[PDB]
Symmetry: C2
Subunit: 51 residues, 2 copies
């Protein structure tokens, strides 16, 4: 069983096609778009700084 | 009565003879605090872009 679990742990496809039920994926976008949010708002402050 | 109410118009004290004046002072404070923060928001956004 430990051997099987290790083999499945290394298998990325098995993780993709098993244990997929959590809602964390939705939250990953909420957190990742923070870089876009920084570049855009810093750019808008820059438009004001120039004008 | 119109004449007396004109005399009311002339005197502001005659409007706050009874000291329940929270209305006017609170309105003025709200507007001025919005000004204080608005001047500060432009000033703080300026410190972040340059210091």
């Amino acid at each position: 069983v430990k051997e099987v679990l290790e083999d499945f742990a290394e298998d990325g496809e098995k993780k993709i096609k098993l244990l997929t039920g959590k809602r964390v994926q939705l939250a990953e976008d909420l957190k990742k778009v923070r870089e876009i949010q920084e570049k855009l708002d810093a750019f808008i402050e820059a438009l004001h700084q120039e004008k």
